[PDB]
Structures are given as C-alpha cells and as structure tokens.
Design a protein around this ligand. Structure first.
Ligand code: CLA
Ligand code: CLA
Ligand code: CLA
Ligand code: CLA
Ligand code: CLA
Ligand code: CLA
Ligand code: CLA
Ligand SMILES: CCCCCCCCCCCCCCCC(=O)OC[C@H](COP(=O)(O)OC[C@@H](O)CO)OC(=O)CCCCCCCCCCCCCCC
Ligand SMILES: CC1=C(/C=C/C(C)=C\C=C\C(C)=C\C=C\C=C(C)\C=C/C=C(C)/C=C/C2=C(C)C(=O)CCC2(C)C)C(C)(C)CCC1
Ligand SMILES: CC1=C(/C=C/C(C)=C/C=C/C(C)=C/C=C/C=C(C)/C=C/C=C(C)/C=C/C2=C(C)CCCC2(C)C)C(C)(C)CCC1
Ligand SMILES: CC1=C(/C=C/C(C)=C/C=C/C(C)=C/C=C/C=C(C)/C=C/C=C(C)/C=C/C2=C(C)CCCC2(C)C)C(C)(C)CCC1
Ligand code: SF4
Ligand SMILES: [Ca+2]
Ligand SMILES: [Mg+2]
Lengths: 157, 40, 729, 80, 31
C-alpha cells in the first residue's frame, strides 16, 4: 500500500551507488533467471558451468556459417560450418585462458571459486569440451537432417 | 506427416517443443521449487 | 521448506504428502495462513479475471485452428455432405495406415473432424471466411489481454477494491441484470439484425459497410414512432435458401415459431426478436434495487418482511447469511447454473438454432452429453458447497428459527423421506425391469407390464401434439388457448406435429421405465448430498463434526467404526450416483436418437422394456464399428476412438484399486520398498528429498474417484462418437 | 460521381431531432463537467435553467460543442 | 481464401502479449 507505487528504486537500497533497481535490472524474474544461469547458479563447480555455457554456445555457433558461409553453396556446407565453429571455439578458449592467466596473478580470493586461477581454468576446460561437443552435435544433426525430418514426420514406421 | 496449411513447418518443431521441452523445463522448475528449503 | 508458502503445517511435512496436499489445497484461500476476508475477496477477484482470460484464449484457439487447418469455407458450400474438421494432426508415432485413415473430409493431411458444432455456430451468426475467424481469434487474444491486465491491476493497492465494494449486492445485481445480461442480449440482437440475418439472405455486412447499410429499408423511422409492425414485415418464405436471397424476406423481428424448412433450426428473426424482448425485461429488472438515489429495494428489508405463522422467523437475516458466505453464494450459483445447463442440453437438441446442425447427429449427441455431464458436476458441487457452508459459515444464533435453521430442525424427516422415495423408486423400477426381462427370456414377451406414459403424452398434446388424440389445449382447435391468433401457433404446430425432428419425441413404456430410473437416480444423488449437508455439522456418531472440518479421514475404528463420516465423503459417494444417473440418461438419449435417425424407432420402442435389450441392442451392437477401429486386417479413422475406449476402461479399472484397497497395506509395502532402496548399493548413492509414504485416506478416495470419472467419461465419449459416426445417425 | 450523400435542410429531422438534441446533450455534459462554469469576464446576468443558465462563456462554449456534435451526427447519419 | 504464413506468424507475436500479462497476473497472485 502506502504511497510507493513506484517501480524504480535505489539499487540495493544505496541511492549513491551508480545503479538503479529497475524491472530489467533487479526484478524478481531477472534475479532468479540471471542468478540461475550456469555463470551464477549456486554451488556449481566451474567445470559444469563451463560445460553448460560451451554446450549452448558451440551448439548455436554452427548456424551462421552453415547457412551464410562461403561453403553454403557447396557439397561441404555443414562441414564448412563445423570447421568454422570449431576454430572459433578454439580461439575463444585461448581468449578465456589468457584472461585467466592475466587476471589471477596475485593472491587468490575466497568468496568466488570461479573468480580464481583454478576456477577460471576449470571454466575454460568445461567451456572447451562443451563448445566442441555442441558444435559437433549440431553439425551431426544438420548433416543427417533427412533422418531427423523422417523421425519428426514418422517417415520410418 | 505433412501439412498443406500455411506455415506447416511450425508443428514440426512445436510438437517436440510442447511435448518434450515445455514439460521437461516446467517440471524441472516446479521440482527445484517444491524442494527449495530456503527458510520461509 | 518453502512450498507450500500458504501453509506452515504442510511446509513442515517431511513426506511426499506435503507435495500432494500442497496441490490439493491451493485454491482453498480461506484456510491459507494469515488470510483475511478482504484479501480473500481480492484474490478471488483477480483469479476470476484470470479465468475469464483463459476462456477467451480457449475460444481464440478454437477459432484459429478452424480458420487455419479446417475446411470452413468448403463446409459452408455443402454443409450436409461435408464433415467439419477441428484441426490438423501432427504425431510422429503415426504409421502409413493411420496417416491414410486420418486424411479425411477432403483434407490433404491427417485431421480430426469437429463435434463441437462450432462450424454451424460460426456460419449461422454470419461468419463466412477464414479471415473473419482469424480476426475474431486475434480480437479474443486482445480481450484476454485486457482481462489479464485488469486482474493484475486490481491487485495493486490503489485499485484494490474494498470489502464493502464486494458486499454491495444491490448495485452488482442491478448491473449484472441490466448491463451484463440485458445490454449484452440487446447488443446480440443488434448483431443478429445487422449481420447474421442479412448474411443469411445473401447480403454481406461487415465493418467495411455496416454503417451505410441499414438492417431494414425503413430504418429507425417506425421504431421512434408507432408503426413497429413494419419490422415484422414480409418474413423469409418457406422456400428461403440459407445464404442466398432466394425466398428471403426483409423482416428483422418476427414471431412465427417452428423451424426454418431447409436448415431445420429456429428462424433468425425469431431469435433476434427473443433477444430484444429479453433485453427489455432484463434492463427493466436491473432497476429493482437501491443504490445511490433513494428509490429501489433493499434485499434485506424484503427478506425480513417475509415471515409466516408456520415458518418461524421466516427469512430474517438471510441477507447477511448469504452475503457473508461465499460458499452459500457459490452453491446457489452452481445449482442454478446446473439447472439451466441441463435446460440448454434439453432445448438445443429439441429446438436447435444453428443452420443444419440437426442433421449432424454426432455433434448433437456429443453436445447433449457434454452439457448434461457439466450439469451433473455443477449440481454435485452446489450441494458440496452447501455442506461446506454448514460446516464453516452457518451461524445458529442469527439464522435462529428462520427457514434455514428449520431445515436442520427436521433434518431426520427430510433424510428419511428421501430414503423412502429412493427405496420406492428402486424396488419397483428394478422389479418391473426384471419382470420384463424374465418374461421375454422364457419366450412370452406379451406378459410385460407396459405402462403408457399418459401424463407426458398428455402434456405433449397440451402443446399441440395430436398423435395421441388427447385433444387438450393446443391439440384442440376450439380451445381458447388456440383461438388467440398467436403468430407463432401455425409454425409451432407444424413443427411439433411432423415426426421429422426432435420436438417432443414420441414416448412409450420404455420412456416410462427410463424416466423412473432417472427419478431414482436424481433422488438417490440428492439424498446422499442432502444427508451429507444436513449431517455435516453433527450426528450421533459425531456430535462435534463441525470441529473436524468439511474433509477429514474418519474418526477411528471406535464407536463402531467411522469410515466415510465427513461430508466430503458424502460428496465423494454422491459422485458415483451422479455418474450413474448421467449414464442412464445419456444411454436413453443416444439409443432413442439412434432409432430416430435410423428411422427404426421400433427397436427402442420394443426392446427398451427389458434390460437385455439395453445390453445387446444398444451397448453390444453399436460397438461393432467402434471396436474394429484397429484389427489384424487394417485400420480406419475409428482407431483413435477404439484406443480411447480401451484407455477409459483401463483408467476406470485403475481407480477401482484406490477405492477397494485401503491405505495401511500400501504403507507397509512402501516400507519394504524403502528398505530395499536403502540397502541396494549404487542406488544407495541417491536418497529421496521427501520421505515416501502411502497416499492418505482422503487422497485415496479422491484419486480413485478421479480415475473412475476420467475412465467413465472417456469410455462413453469414445463409444457415443464412434458409433454415431460409423453409422452416421 | 462517388460523393458522400448529405441532406438538404430537413428542418424537421435535421433540426430538433439532431441539431437541437445534440446541443441539449452538450448542455448536459457541460453542466455536469465544466469546472469553472460562471467564472467568465462576462456575467450575462439572469441565471436561468439551461438556455442561458450559468455563464455567457459556459453557454457559448457548450453551444459551439453542441454544433460540432450536431454537424458530425447529421453528416454521419446522412451516409458520410 | 486460405490463411497466409504472415497471418500465422503475426498471431504468435500478438499472443506474446497475453503470455506476458498471464505471467504478471500469476506472479502477483503468488504474493
Ligand atoms: C451517431 C454519431 C455519428 C455517426 C455514427 C458518425 C458516422 C461517421 N462519421 Mg462522424 N462524427 C460525429 C458523430 C458521428 N459520426 C461527431 C459528433 C463528430 C465531431 C467530433 C464527428 C466527426 C467526424 C469526422 C471528422 C469524420 C467523421 C467520419 C464518419 C464516417 C466514418 C467512416 C470511418 O470508418 O471512419 C474512418 C476509420 C478509421 C479506422 C480511421 C482512423 C485512422 C486515423 C487517421 C488515425 C489518426 C490518429 C490521430 C492522429 C490521433 C488523434 C490525436 C489525439 C487527439 C489523440 C461515418 C459514416 C469521417 C467521414 O465523414 O468520412 C467521410 C470523418 O472524416 N466523423
Ligand atoms: C546468423 C544467425 C543464425 C543463423 C543463420 C542460424 C542458423 C541455424 N540455427 Mg541458430 N541461433 C542463432 C543464430 C543463427 N542461427 C542465435 C543468435 C541463437 C540464440 C543463441 C540461435 C539458437 C538456435 C537453436 C537452439 C537452434 C538453432 C538452430 C539453427 C539451424 C536450424 C535450421 C535448420 O537447418 O533446420 C533444422 C533444425 C533442427 C533439426 C533442430 C532440431 C529440433 C530441435 C532439437 C528442437 C527439439 C527440442 C527437443 C526438446 C530437444 C530434445 C532433447 C531433449 C530435451 C529431449 C540453422 C542452420 C537449430 C539447430 O542447430 O538445428 C540442429 C537449433 O536447435 N539456432
Ligand atoms: C610446444 C609446446 C606447446 C604445445 C604442444 C601446446 C599445445 C596446445 N596448446 Mg599451449 N601453451 C604453451 C605451449 C604449448 N602448447 C605455453 C608455453 C603456453 C604459455 C604461454 C601456452 C598457453 C596456451 C593457452 C592459453 C592455450 C593453449 C592451448 C593449446 C592447445 C590448442 C591448440 C593450439 O594452441 O595450437 C598449437 C600451438 C602451438 C603449435 C604453439 C605452442 C607454443 C606457443 C607459445 C603457445 C602459445 C599459446 C597461444 C597464446 C594460444 C594459441 C591460440 C590458438 C588460436 C591457437 C594445444 C594442444 C589452448 C587450449 O585449448 O588449452 C586447453 C589454450 O587455451 N596454450
Ligand atoms: C487454448 C487454445 C489453444 C489450444 C487448446 C490449441 C491446441 C493446439 N495447438 Mg494452437 N494456437 C492457439 C491456441 C490453441 N491451440 C493460438 C491462439 C494460436 C495463435 C497464436 C496458436 C498457434 C499454434 C501453432 C503455430 C501451432 C499450434 C499447434 C497446436 C496443437 C499442438 C500443441 C501446440 O504445439 O501448441 C502451441 C501453441 C502456441 C505456440 C501458441 C500458444 C497458444 C495460446 C495463445 C496459449 C494458450 C494458453 C492456455 C489458455 C493456458 C491454459 C492451460 C490450462 C491447462 C491451465 C494443439 C492441438 C500446432 C499444430 O497446429 O499442430 C498440428 C502448431 O504448430 N497452435
Ligand atoms: C454493466 C456493468 C458490469 C458488467 C458488464 C459486469 C460484468 C462482469 N462482472 Mg461485474 N460488477 C459491476 C458491474 C458490471 N460487471 C459493479 C458495478 C460491481 C460492484 C457492485 C461489480 C462487481 C463484480 C464482482 C465482485 C465480480 C464481477 C464479475 C463480473 C463478470 C462475471 C463473470 C462472467 O464473465 O460471466 C459472464 C456472464 C454473462 C455473459 C451473462 C450470463 C449468461 C447466462 C448465465 C446464460 C447464457 C446466455 C446464452 C445462452 C449464452 C450463449 C452461449 C454461447 C456460447 C453461444 C462479468 C464479465 C466477477 C468476475 O469474474 O470478476 C472478473 C466478479 O468477481 N462483478
Ligand atoms: C465452479 C466454481 C467452484 C469454485 C470456484 C470452487 C472452489 C473451491 N472448492 Mg469446489 N466444487 C465445484 C466447484 C467450485 N469449487 C464442483 C463443480 C464440485 C464437484 C466436483 C466441487 C466440489 C468440491 C469439494 C468436495 C471440495 C471443493 C473444495 C473447494 C476449495 C478448494 C479448491 C482446491 O484447492 O482444490 C484443488 C483441486 C484439485 C487438486 C483437483 C483438480 C482436478 C482436475 C481439475 C481434474 C483432473 C482431470 C484429469 C487429470 C484428466 C486427465 C485427462 C487424460 C486422461 C486424457 C475451493 C475454494 C474443497 C474444499 O476446500 O472444501 C472447502 C473440497 O473439499 N469443491
Ligand atoms: C447396481 C449397484 C448398486 C445397487 C443395486 C445399489 C442399491 C442401493 N443403493 Mg447404492 N451405491 C452403489 C451401487 C449400488 N447401490 C455404488 C457403486 C456406490 C458408491 C460407493 C453407492 C453408494 C450409495 C449411497 C451413498 C447410497 C446408496 C443408496 C442405495 C439404495 C437406494 C434405494 C433404492 O435403490 O431402492 C430400493 C433398493 C434396491 C432396488 C436394491 C435392493 C435390490 C434387491 C435385489 C431387492 C430384493 C432383496 C433380495 C431378494 C434379498 C434376498 C437375498 C437372498 C436371495 C440371498 C439402494 C438399496 C442410498 C440409500 O441408502 O438409500 C436409502 C444411499 O444413501 N448407494
Ligand atoms: C415435483 C415434486 C416436488 C417434491 C418436493 C418434496 C415433496 C414434499 C412436499 C414438501 C412439503 C414441505 C412442507 C412445508 C412445511 C409447511 O407447510 O410450512 C408452512 C408454510 C407456511 O409458512 P408461510 O408461507 O406463512 O411463511 C412465510 C414465508 O415468507 C416463509 O416461508 O407453507 C408453505 O411453506 C407451503 C409451501 C410448502 C411447499 C414447498 C415448496 C416446494 C416446491 C416449491 C416450488 C417453487 C415455485 C416458485 C414459482 C414462483
Ligand atoms: C455513437 C453511438 C452510437 C453508435 C454506435 C455505432 C455507430 C456503432 C457501434 C457498434 C458496436 C457497439 C459494436 C459492438 C461490437 C461488440 C462486439 C463484437 C462484442 C463482443 C464480441 C465477443 C465477446 C466475441 C465474440 C466471438 C468472436 C470473436 C468470434 O469470432 C466467434 C464468436 C464469439 C466467440 C462470440 C449509437 C447512436 C448507437 C448510440 C449513441 C452512441
Ligand atoms: C526463448 C526465450 C529465451 C531465449 C533462449 C535462447 C536464446 C536459447 C537458445 C538455446 C540453446 C542454444 C540451447 C542448446 C542446446 C545445446 C545442447 C543440448 C548441446 C550439446 C552437446 C552435446 C550433446 C555434445 C556431445 C559430445 C561431447 C560433449 C563430446 C563427444 C562428442 C559429442 C558430440 C558426442 C529466454 C529464456 C532468454 C527468454 C524467453 C524466451
Ligand atoms: C445444501 C445447502 C444449500 C442448497 C444447495 C442446493 C443444490 C439447492 C438446490 C435446489 C434445486 C436444484 C432446485 C431446483 C428447482 C426448480 C424449480 C423451483 C422449478 C420451478 C418451476 C416452475 C414453476 C415451472 C413452471 C412451468 C411449467 C412446469 C411449464 C409451463 C411454464 C411454467 C412456468 C408455468 C444452500 C447453499 C442453498 C444453503 C446451504 C445448504
Ligand atoms: S478403516 Fe480407515 S477409515 Fe475406517 S476407521 Fe479405520 S482408519 Fe478410519
Ligand atoms: Ca460477410
Ligand atoms: Mg437452440
């Protein structure tokens, strides 16, 4: 009740922190949704976080080159997409690992097991395995798109 | 299984989405919710 | 744990029961923790908005799938020879045979045919294209959005309605009669006169032109003057052909009764006139009660002023009794709505309003069965919430000596006389049926006790049915009831005296016997429900039952044993009798109309007297096609109905398990299973978050009844649909 | 020629049945809706019932509004 | 005439509005 029908408030109750509590920044839905993504989900080991993020990213990264790459109008369309996505995930893993190497040179913190050298390295390992796996399974599903189509239509029974 | 109606590629992916993904996700959310032991 | 947040008791339950009960008590807002009355009404208001929105979205889905995957525009051309399709099938399980079997009704892909009568409805009210249905569905998307947003907004503090706003019965009655019922019926008469009736005459009227094309060539001039008869005008001729101007009239408001000769349904001008008259009456009635201008009635004063020397306190304080009990209000709404839902069922099959729907026999059977089952559920719920009222809300001191309390005062008389009428009916109806069965078995069917239903035949005669020759009222031309010059009398008589429709179907001894079966069923279901409601506060086995709530397991094995003591148990028992009653009435309807449509009325007339005729000529025979939906030789479009028939048998028999075998045996078995898990290595790595336990006693009753009812309804639906569709009436 | 059909000076239907009726309607909703009815520069004294009830500006404005309403309604009821 | 692909896809976008409003009403009724 009262007089505050207002939907925007000071972020975390401190009006002098440069941020605002808004329906996009700090609603219950965004808190629960962002807070349960692999990056923030409570209790997860960084290996599983990396694995999940890599699965999602490797899976979806096959598409752009698959439909729009230079081999899209060749007999090696899906292989071209796969090669592109694999090389991209390799470069991304190198970027993640270089980041971990440079930002965790000093004393290791304690609150965030992902924000350590060991944790960020585990995240990179999981991300590599998940990205390569997701890219290869997206490629495998696309390369056998006819059997997936017949499966979804019942063309085999 | 086919369809001559408009945009007949929609059941193709919506039937798996309604039968597999929607129930899996909603049951998983409700499962983690009813088991949540946060005080209150 | 958090779930459920509205009950600390359930939240601290360490067993799986916590889950079940959390699901089972969600909507019982009154027993949530910390619930106040105002918050109760506000939550109910917002839930109501959500429910209306769900209804609108459902209707949108119906419109959308007919417009997208149906054959509406084709069905409009040849509505008697084309089967309306509901939506497309997409099932990766189908084989070639089923794919072939379900590319039907002219479709180029697997499809189901619709039995909701929705094609006839949309076509009668003036819609002719898929674009119109799609626009309707998008509009209903928007309407549902509006009601959803309103529901959200009325949970906001500034827009939260006060308790006194919810308790203003006079203003709400005024608005619902004059506006919700009255202006809606007026607007519908306007749609009929503006769109549906012109569309039925070959004219197009839509948003592109409805401003510049009047419904009548005279237009409003006769209305605001005298001269109202101009609108009764020249009606559609007997040769009028629906959708064209051949034989079409110009009138917009008629009263000629009977049915349209080609479409076998009520005349659209009669329907428009009906809605205009109903609008007038409802608008007038919506001024009865006092609001903001002194004039108007106080319901409280009316109720208090109605006392007699033989009813004690009369209706004193009934205004507060009803205005403070949401369960009293809900029971009243449920009973009244169930009565008029049965009324809808009885009148739509007899006096249909949608063009050509009478010749669509599967839709007629399905809609009748649908509305009758809805009515049965509504009636049972009405009595259940009356019991809940007596348990939770009834006040003896304020209701003291009035009619409400006096009903409790002589409850033993009521319950005993209900028992007596049920015994009377059961004993003698079963006795006549069994006499007829034995007498026909031994090869002497002439010794059947065949009672002619003279009273219902005489009533049919009073309305004009001359077949029996009673010559009473409308069956006698000399009658003052028939010498009035009523404009509807020629059409009404022409319709009711042709044996070509379902307007007062001819009846005989079979109808007598099934009507007494129906009376037995109604009386026994009412007896169970009323005994439960009147003993819910207390009996001699439980003189303190009101302290134990509406629903509880029992009172233990002491005092003789107290299984099924709660009024909830009375509801649960009455559900079986409601389902039995509806089985009898739908068997009657379906078999009689099977004879009517087939032309062979003699089968029902001569074999509905003994129950073996019901067994073989109705149930056993009409399964032949249904049961051959799939066989070692192939598959046809009845395969779904055969598999659903079996599915319903299975679900019903499965509910038998929960009903017959009670709980302790299962808890011991679950304890053996718990030990088996805790001692099996590898599986020992995993443990349950909730302790597994057997379902509770009440939970068992409810789950068994749910399986019983699902199987009941699905079995009979598959049978009805498949038999009427394979035979085609 | 494809032109929306109006009406010649009916002076039975066009007048009171529409124009004066719309003017009376504007009278009513202005009477019940104008915040400052008689706060005009011009008193235009003898406060009456409706024709010249509260103030000269109330009268003039509600009458201009009634003429807008009546023009719209006459034109609409005569096709467009 | 037959509905178009554009009409089918346009109705899904429109249905996104009742979806969001039903989510809002649900989560508020949870309070
Ligand atoms: C019983 C009363 C009555 C009746 C039934 C009619 C009947 C009619 N009127 Mg009329 N009208 C009335 C009263 C009435 N009017 C009154 C009291 C007024 C005074 C305000 C008007 C003034 C009025 C005007 C100015 C016009 C009509 C027009 C019309 C015709 C409209 C056809 C159409 O579909 O429009 C069109 C349908 C649309 C969907 C167009 C809407 C799209 C617009 C362009 C969106 C613009 C948004 C805008 C910028 C936002 C507003 C800004 C801000 C103030 C919010 C129609 C036959 C039109 C006409 O005569 O046609 C020849 C016309 O020009 N009426
Ligand atoms: C330049 C932008 C771009 C491009 C051109 C593509 C291109 C493509 N995408 Mg991608 N996408 C993009 C951006 C892009 N995407 C972005 C920004 C996202 C969000 C991060 C996605 C996320 C996305 C997903 C999630 C998917 C695609 C898929 C696809 C392919 C589907 C087309 C096809 O071949 O049909 C054929 C499509 C299929 C055969 C999909 C199979 C059916 C799936 C499995 C749905 C069934 C759900 C079911 C519940 C799963 C069962 C497992 C279990 C839960 C029971 C296609 C090559 C699909 C794909 O990769 O196909 C393998 C796919 O699943 N996209
Ligand atoms: C001969 C020694 C040697 C060899 C066999 C490898 C082999 C490998 N390294 Mg490693 N690396 C080395 C030394 C070596 N490294 C040293 C000394 C460092 C510290 C600077 C690193 C730091 C490094 C990082 C941060 C990462 C790798 C990764 C990898 C794998 C990805 C493939 C690749 O990078 O191409 C083959 C590489 C070579 C033939 C040259 C090796 C020697 C140079 C100095 C390595 C420089 C690393 C560079 C920044 C990352 C390359 C980017 C990528 C796009 C190729 C691969 C199996 C990636 C991985 O997936 O790890 C799990 C990754 O994230 N390396
Ligand atoms: C409640 C109404 C309703 C119902 C019962 C159905 C039923 C069905 N639809 Mg349909 N649909 C509807 C409305 C409805 N539809 C509307 C309004 C649209 C336009 C936005 C669509 C657009 C749509 C498409 C594109 C497809 C279906 C399809 C299907 C079939 C497979 C299920 C599915 O994939 O749905 C998916 C549904 C959507 C993507 C849109 C959501 C539908 C509405 C807006 C939400 C309904 C919420 C509901 C009222 C919540 C109450 C649930 C209750 C238990 C508490 C199924 C028989 C598939 C089909 O045709 O099978 C061959 C198909 O591919 N629907
Ligand atoms: C004219 C003003 C007006 C109108 C339009 C309404 C309308 C409505 N009110 Mg409201 N109300 C009003 C004023 C009004 N109210 C005022 C002033 C108050 C304060 C005193 C209230 C306080 C109030 C409360 C507290 C509640 C409502 C509720 C409702 C809804 C009732 C449920 C429903 O949808 O059934 C619709 C009913 C009909 C369309 C008519 C009944 C039909 C009869 C029974 C038979 C059917 C006829 C015909 C054969 C049908 C054809 C079938 C078809 C398929 C072919 C309804 C839409 C309830 C609600 O749901 O809240 C959202 C509710 O909780 N009202
Ligand atoms: C129409 C208005 C209406 C309203 C709003 C209410 C409101 C209420 N009722 Mg009531 N009642 C009604 C009608 C109504 N009822 C009817 C029609 C009946 C007869 C069946 C009853 C009989 C009744 C009883 C006996 C009781 C209530 C109770 C309650 C309260 C608790 C609700 C709850 O949380 O249960 C939640 C419900 C469930 C968990 C079960 C849902 C069952 C689903 C819908 C059926 C499942 C079908 C199956 C899955 C289909 C499978 C298909 C597949 C095989 C193809 C609540 C305030 C209870 C109470 O609290 O008493 C005060 C109580 O004991 N009602
Ligand atoms: C075909 C099954 C069946 C039958 C025959 C009955 C019978 C009866 N039920 Mg019942 N019921 C049933 C199923 C059945 N129930 C089920 C599944 C449920 C859900 C659990 C219920 C729950 C239920 C409730 C809650 C109530 C009833 C009631 C009644 C009585 C109603 C009065 C009547 O029918 O008139 C007269 C009775 C009869 C026609 C039945 C007797 C028939 C015999 C054959 C008469 C001849 C006697 C015979 C020769 C004895 C000699 C035996 C010797 C040869 C060994 C009646 C005795 C109501 C009641 O008690 O009424 C007061 C009541 O309250 N039933
Ligand atoms: C189809 C068969 C129906 C079976 C029903 C059960 C049969 C058993 C007979 C019941 C006798 C009850 C004894 C009452 C005990 C009794 O005699 O009380 C005496 C009572 C006198 O009280 P007063 O009328 O003076 O009280 C003033 C009122 O304001 C308060 O009641 O007289 C009656 O109530 C007659 C009505 C009884 C009949 C009940 C109505 C049943 C049907 C109602 C139809 C409504 C139609 C409304 C249309 C406008
Ligand atoms: C200026 C004004 C007036 C002039 C009004 C004019 C000039 C036009 C008014 C037109 C009106 C008031 C149209 C109202 C339409 C209401 C509708 C359409 C309501 C509900 C529709 C529903 C609820 C859903 C229906 C469904 C749909 C969508 C389907 O497609 C399937 C069937 C069903 C499910 C029923 C007059 C002079 C008169 C009085 C003075 C003020
Ligand atoms: C709708 C929506 C949204 C969005 C979403 C998105 C954007 C997403 C996408 C999604 C995705 C993106 C998904 C995925 C999936 C994936 C997967 C499932 C994977 C995989 C992989 C695999 C399975 C692999 C395997 C392997 C390995 C690992 C190794 C060996 C090789 C192989 C291949 C075997 C949101 C909620 C936000 C909001 C609302 C709406
Ligand atoms: C428990 C309870 C309750 C109850 C419930 C219920 C459920 C009831 C009911 C009941 C019922 C369910 C009833 C019914 C009825 C009916 C009637 C009452 C009828 C009437 C009629 C008439 C009168 C008619 C007439 C006529 C004819 C016959 C024909 C021609 C025309 C005329 C109109 C003349 C309550 C809540 C309330 C309270 C608490 C407790
Ligand atoms: S058998 Fe069950 S219901 Fe009956 S008294 Fe014992 S515990 Fe209660
Ligand atoms: Ca039209
Ligand atoms: Mg009808």
């Amino acid at each position: 009740m009262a007089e505050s029908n207002q939907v925007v408030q000071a972020y975390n109750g401190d009006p002098f922190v440069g941020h605002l509590s808004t329906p996009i920044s700090d609603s219950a839905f965004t808190r629960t949704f962002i807070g349960n993504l692999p990056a923030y989900r409570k209790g997860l080991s960084p290996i599983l976080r990396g694995l999940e993020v890599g699965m999602a990213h490797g899976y979806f990264l096959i598409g752009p080159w698959t439909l729009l790459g230079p081999l899209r109008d060749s007999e090696y369309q899906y292989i071209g997409g796969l090669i592109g996505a694999l090389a991209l995930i390799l470069v991304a893993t190198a970027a993640l690992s270089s980041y971990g190497l440079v930002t965790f040179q000093g004393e290791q913190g304690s609150g965030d097991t992902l924000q350590t050298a060991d944790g960020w390295s585990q995240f990179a390992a999981g991300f590599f395995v998940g990205g390569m796996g997701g890219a290869f399974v997206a490629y495998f599903l696309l390369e056998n798109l006819s059997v997936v189509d017949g499966i979804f239509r019942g063309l085999f029974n | 299984m086919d369809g001559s109606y408009a945009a007949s590629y929609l059941p193709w992916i919506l039937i798996p989405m309604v039968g597999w993904l929607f129930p899996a996700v909603t049951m998983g959310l409700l499962f983690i919710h009813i088991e949540s032991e946060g005080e209150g | 744990t958090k779930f459920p947040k509205f009950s600390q008791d359930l939240a601290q339950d360490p067993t799986t029961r916590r889950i079940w009960y959390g699901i089972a008590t969600a909507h019982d807002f009154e027993t949530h923790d910390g619930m106040t009355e105002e918050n109760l009404y506000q939550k109910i208001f917002a839930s109501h908005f959500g429910h209306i929105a769900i209804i609108f979205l459902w209707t949108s889905g119906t419109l959308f799938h007919v417009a997208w995957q149906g054959n509406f525009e084709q069905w409009i051309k040849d509505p008697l020879n084309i089967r309306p399709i509901a939506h497309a099938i997409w099932d990766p399980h189908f084989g070639e045979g089923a794919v072939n079997a379900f590319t039907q009704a002219g479709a180029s892909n697997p499809v189901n045919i619709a039995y909701s009568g929705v094609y006839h409805w949309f076509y009668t009210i003036g819609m002719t294209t898929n674009q119109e249905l799609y626009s309707g569905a998008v509009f209903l998307l928007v309407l549902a959005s509006l009601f959803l947003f309103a529901g959200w907004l009325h949970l906001q503090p500034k827009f939260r309605p006060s308790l006194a706003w919810f308790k203003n019965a006079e203003s709400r009655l005024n608005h619902h009669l004059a506006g919700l019922f009255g202006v809606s019926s007026l607007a519908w008469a306007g749609h009929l006169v503006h769109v549906a009736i012109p569309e039925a005459r070959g004219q197009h009227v839509g948003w592109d032109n409805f401003l510049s094309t009047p419904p009548h060539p005279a237009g409003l001039m006769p209305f605001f003057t005298g001269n109202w008869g101009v609108y009764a005008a020249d009606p559609d001729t007997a040769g009028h052909i629906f959708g064209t101007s051949e034989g079409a009239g110009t009138a917009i408001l008629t009263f000629l009764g009977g049915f349209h000769p080609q479409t076998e349904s009520l005349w659209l001008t009669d329907i428009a006139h009906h809605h205009l008259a109903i609008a007038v009456i409802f608008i007038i009635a919506g001024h009865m009660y006092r609001t903001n201008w002194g004039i108007g009635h106080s319901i409280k004063e009316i109720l208090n002023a109605h006392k007699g020397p033989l009813t004690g306190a009369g209706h004193t304080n009934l205004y507060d009794t009803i205005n403070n009990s949401l369960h009293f209000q809900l029971g009243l709404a449920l009973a009244s709505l169930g009565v008029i839902t049965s009324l809808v069922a009885q009148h739509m099959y007899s006096l249909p309003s949608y063009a050509f729907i009478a010749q669509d026999h599967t839709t007629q059977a399905a809609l009748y069965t649908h509305h009758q089952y809805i009515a049965g559920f509504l009636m049972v719920g009405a009595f259940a919430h009356g019991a809940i009222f007596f348990v939770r809300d009834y006040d003896p001191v304020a209701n003291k000596d009035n009619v409400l309390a006096r009903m409790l005062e002589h409850k033993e008389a009521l319950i005993s006389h209900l028992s007596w009428v049920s015994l009377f009916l059961g004993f003698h109806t079963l006795g006549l049926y069994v006499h007829n069965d034995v007498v026909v078995a031994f090869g002497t069917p002439e010794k059947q006790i065949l009672i002619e239903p003279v009273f219902a035949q005489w009533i049919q005669a009073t309305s004009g049915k001359a077949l029996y020759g009673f010559d009473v009222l409308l069956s006698n031309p000399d009658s003052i009831a028939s010498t009035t010059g009523a404009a509807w009398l020629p059409g009404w008589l022409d319709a009711i005296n042709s044996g070509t429709n379902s307007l007062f179907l001819t009846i005989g001894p079979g109808d007598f016997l099934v009507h007494h079966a129906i009376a037995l069923g109604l009386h026994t279901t009412a007896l169970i429900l009323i005994k439960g409601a009147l003993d819910a506060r207390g009996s001699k086995l439980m003189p303190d039952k009101k302290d134990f709530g509406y629903s509880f397991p029992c009172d233990g094995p002491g005092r003789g044993g107290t299984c099924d003591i709660s009024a909830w148990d009375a509801f649960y028992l009455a559900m079986f009798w409601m389902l039995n009653t509806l089985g009898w009435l739908t068997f009657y309807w379906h078999w009689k109309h099977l004879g009517v449509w087939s032309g062979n009325v003699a089968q029902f007339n001569e074999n509905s007297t003994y129950l073996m005729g019901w067994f073989r000529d109705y149930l056993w025979a009409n399964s032949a096609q249904l049961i051959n939906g799939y066989n070692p030789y192939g598959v046809n479009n009845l395969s779904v109905w055969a598999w659903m028939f079996l599915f319903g048998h299975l679900v019903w028999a499965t509910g038998f398990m929960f009903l017959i075998s009670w709980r302790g045996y299962w808890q011991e078995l679950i304890e053996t299973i718990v030990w088996a898990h805790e001692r099996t290595p590898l599986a020992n790595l995993v443990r349950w978050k909730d302790k597994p336990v057997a379902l509770s006693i009440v939970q068992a009753r409810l789950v068994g009844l749910a399986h019983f009812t699902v199987g009941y309804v699905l079995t009979y639906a598959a049978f009805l649909i498949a038999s009427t569709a394979g035979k085609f009436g | 020629l494809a032109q929306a059909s109006p009406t010649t000076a009916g002076w039975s239907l066009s007048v009171g049945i529409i124009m004066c009726l719309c003017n009376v309607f504007a009278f009513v909703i202005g009477y019940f809706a104008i915040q400052k009815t008689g706060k005009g520069k011009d008193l235009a004294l003898p406060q009456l019932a409706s024709k010249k009830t509260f103030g000269l500006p109330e009268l003039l404005a509600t009458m201009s509004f009634g003429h807008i309403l009546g023009a719209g309604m006459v034109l609409g009821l005569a096709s467009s | 005439m037959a509905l178009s692909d554009t009409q089918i896809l346009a109705a899904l976008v429109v249905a996104l509005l009742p979806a969001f409003l039903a989510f809002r009403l649900s989560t508020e009724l949870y309070k």
